[PDB]
């Protein structure tokens, strides 16, 4: 279907504790596929996914020197902002950037973009039109006006519509196979003390991928919309994820409640009950 | 492929 290539960049300063830490992470369809950390010994632009190891050392050297160069401009920007905001040089700060494009199954551009953030707050963004900017405060206006006066958007656009796309095309060919991987969840239910006239039933789903999943409880066909306990889908630390949901049902009435699990990997939405 | 970021 649709795909996208993005780059998440962070530049964080460590006042009088060395140079700022620069990290550029690359994603394809939300899957990290390349990375560059400056705090690594002899920094290199490492391939994060196997299907990437099929690129020539020429590419790896190119992208490494690109990052190093960006790491430099960023080291400068940090100081520039420091002055836009009149902030002590002694405090630490952060610049984050998100750049990339999202293309449709037709291979056409659906949305390109570039957003900046300073200390966790949106700084400036490139608009839908890929021609204008939107500043989020007095400081960003300066960058805005400069970038207007320099044609930055035009150059940036040129990258989002072309360079960025073509490379998304190339990465996908070498790794679509892998990007299709899917792991169906395994589910079981658990009964819990919960002292009183009630009990807790926890519906577990583990070892699944992608992280997208939905867990829901039912009482004799009708669905439960209240007092459902859920936990943010979490990484099992082995490529797969896990998540659970629970409800405190009146004791005895265990059977009357059933759990449901929907996941693109499953051939069909499994149904759990808890079996004594 | 990365973008050549400019200055803020």
């Amino acid at each position, epitope marked *: 279907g649709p795909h996208s290539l993005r780059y998440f960049v962070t530049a964080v300063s460590r006042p009088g504790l060395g140079e700022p830490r620069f990290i550029s992470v690359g994603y394809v369809d939300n899957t990290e596929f390349v990375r560059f950390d400056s705090d690594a010994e002899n920094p290199r632009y490492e391939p994060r996914a196997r299907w990437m190891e099929q690129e020539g050392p020429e590419y790896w050297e190119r992208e490494t020197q690109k990052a190093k160069g960006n790491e430099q401009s960023f080291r400068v920007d940090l100081r520039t902002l420091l002055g836009y905001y009149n902030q002590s040089k002694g405090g630490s700060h952060t610049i984050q950037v998100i750049s990339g494009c999202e293309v449709g199954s037709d291979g056409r551009l659906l949305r390109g973009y570039q957003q900046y953030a300073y200390d966790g707050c949106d700084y400036i963004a490139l608009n839908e039109d890929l021609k204008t900017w939107t500043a989020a405060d007095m400081a960003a206006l300066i960058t805005k006006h400069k970038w207007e006066q320099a044609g930055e958007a035009e150059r940036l656009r040129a990258y989002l519509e072309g360079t960025c796309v073509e490379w998304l095309r190339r990465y996908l060919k070498n790794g679509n196979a892998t990007l299709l991987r899917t792991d169906s969840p395994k589910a079981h239910v658990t009964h819990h003390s919960r002292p009183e006239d009630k009990v807790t039933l926890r519906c577990w789903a583990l070892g699944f991928y992608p992280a997208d999943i939905t867990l829901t409880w039912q009482l004799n066909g009708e669905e439960l919309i209240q007092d459902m306990e859920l936990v943010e889908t979490r990484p099992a630390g082995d490529g797969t994820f896990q998540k659970w949901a629970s409800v405190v049902v009146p004791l005895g009435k265990e059977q009357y409640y059933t759990c449901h699990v929907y996941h693109q990997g499953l051939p069909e939405p499994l149904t759990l009950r808890w079996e004594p | 492929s990365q973008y050549y970021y*400019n200055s803020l």
Partner: T-cell receptor, first 113, second 116 residues
Framework: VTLLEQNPRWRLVPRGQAVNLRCILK??????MSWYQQDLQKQLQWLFT????????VKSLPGADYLATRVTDTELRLQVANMSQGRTLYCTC??????????FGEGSRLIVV | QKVTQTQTSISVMEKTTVTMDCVYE???????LFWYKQTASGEIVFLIR??????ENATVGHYSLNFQKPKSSIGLIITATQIEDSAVYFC??????????????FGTGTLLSVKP
């Protein structure tokens, strides 16, 4: 009405005598400064680009050994040493890292006497 | 990264169309072509620029470029020349990536002589 102030404008010197050039930025909108050499054949070549106060760097082209430093946000220096042939040094300023809008100063014509 | 200008010198009458060639080389997908002027006083002056990602030829003053991406050519076209245009025209391309930006690569230079 000019962006950079380059000094000394010219210099006559006996081969080997070291020479100190200085460049002054008269506009905060072009903090990206660089050094360019133009040899006696009128050929321009880039030497350095120092953006931050503190940045030091050396390079050696045939005929001269250089050493430039971005002393302050407004002062960029250069130290020409062991000069064997004439050359004129150009100081340049640009709005940002990308460039594409670099203005050349008047230069520092250095002559070997 | 070999921007070259073959013409050592060009002498032509005023009010005449003169075209100064410049061939270039770069691997970068995006880049920038430039044309500068130097006078007897010894000062360089920016004339016009070209953006690799614009299919149309740039235009400023009476200067015009014949950008031909497929043939890496980007000559300068000075129309209705005059006694002031007489100077040395340099052709330059900004390109390498990272340690470039403010690193232009200049051509050998071509001296235009506009005969009155």
């Amino acid at each position: 009405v000019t962006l950079l102030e380059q000094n000394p404008r010219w210099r006559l010197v006996p081969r080997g005598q070291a020479v100190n050039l200085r460049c002054i930025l008269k506009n905060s909108q072009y903090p990206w400064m660089s050094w360019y050499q133009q040899d006696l054949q009128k050929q321009l070549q880039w030497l350095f680009t120092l953006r931050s106060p503190g940045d030091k760097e050396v390079k050696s082209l045939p005929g001269a050994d250089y050493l430039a430093t971005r002393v302050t946000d407004t002062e960029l220096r250069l130290q020409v040493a062991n000069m064997s042939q004439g050359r004129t040094l150009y100081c340049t300023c640009s709005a940002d890292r990308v460039g594409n809008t670099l203005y050349f100063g008047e230069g520092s014509r250095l002559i070997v006497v | 990264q070999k921007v070259t200008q073959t013409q050592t010198s060009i002498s032509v009458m005023e009010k005449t169309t003169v075209t100064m060639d410049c061939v270039y080389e770069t691997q970068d997908s995006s880049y920038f072509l430039f044309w500068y002027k130097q006078t007897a006083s010894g000062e360089i002056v920016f004339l016009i620029r070209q953006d690799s990602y614009k299919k149309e030829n740039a235009t400023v003053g009476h200067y015009s470029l014949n950008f031909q991406k497929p043939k890496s050519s980007i000559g300068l076209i000075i129309t209705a020349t005059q006694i002031e245009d007489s100077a040395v025209y340099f052709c330059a391309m900004r390109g390498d990536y990272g340690g470039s930006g403010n690193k232009l690569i200049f051509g050998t230079g071509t001296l235009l002589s506009v005969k009155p």
